Symmetry: C3
């Protein structure tokens, strides 16, 4: 009189939900890559912006033996606020990812044990 | 003859899935911070780009009492399309976050009630 | 003697978890839009950076009939590495999204069948 068939569907449904949850984590990693890739491009752009400061006046002297170079800062380089804040941001993600793996690992073990118990009822 | 042990595992498994789901929301917030932080840096870069337009020709005159300044636009500032579209983007997230909290709140209450019912069977 | 009420809560709880999971996918799409929108702005900024290279020296000649134009590259345009890598990044998301829809579709069908079975016990 036990509803094993209903439980098999419920137990199976939990597995499908677990897979989508794990799948979301993989998708999240791809999004993180896009953001980080933009930062690498940003580092190159600031370097180029500095070159623009070097460009000031070409041939601005035809009766003098001197050239005026005005390399005024262009890209504001972040020394501590972004690096310290970004490292903390990445670190929070690292602890959160480790926590999700722990719950997924226990869920996988528990998931197999729950199904095994169902078999024991009518093994 | 009831499979309370199997149900305890199934009920417990749902709680573990709920935690990972809530955990994903926290991780998502960290990703949003990285994107928003880049925008703050972008606002500073456009300001610097405007300064580059000001740089045009230094000392390009040694027999005249005048200086040619050509501050031609450099960074295209967004007045309505990004602000109106970005506000809508943030607003959609705000309604979605509120909807997730409602489902999590009901799940927590329902989760405790489901376990309490299991205790009533053999309390 | 069956715990249908407990199962109804467990079955209902799974539906609530499924909704939040689907809700996370919608939220993820909004985050992807923010990242892609920044790239469109970046494409415009590189074009503006090229214009800065054109600006070199205005009026740097008052006794000559010539102008010195030095349009040295400014923004490093990505021809193959970002496009090929970004297309692969978007493609991975496309396969992952299709996989999530398949699991959600099966879960919806299975979810309705699990509830229908509960009704059959006492229909």
């Amino acid at each position: 009189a036990q509803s094993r068939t209903l439980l098999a569907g419920i137990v199976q449904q939990q597995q499908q939900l677990l897979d989508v949850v794990k799948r979301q984590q993989e998708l999240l990693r791809l999004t993180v890559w896009g953001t980080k890739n933009l930062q690498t491009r940003v580092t190159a752009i600031e370097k180029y912006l500095k070159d623009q400061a070097q460009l000031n006046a070409w041939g601005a002297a035809f009766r003098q033996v001197a050239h005026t170079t005005v390399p005024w800062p262009n890209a504001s380089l972040t020394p501590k606020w972004n690096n310290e804040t970004w490292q903390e941001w990445e670190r929070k993600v690292d602890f959160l990812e480790e926590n999700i793996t722990a719950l997924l690992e226990e869920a996988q073990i528990q998931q197999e044990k729950n199904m095994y118990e169902l078999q024991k009822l009518n093994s």
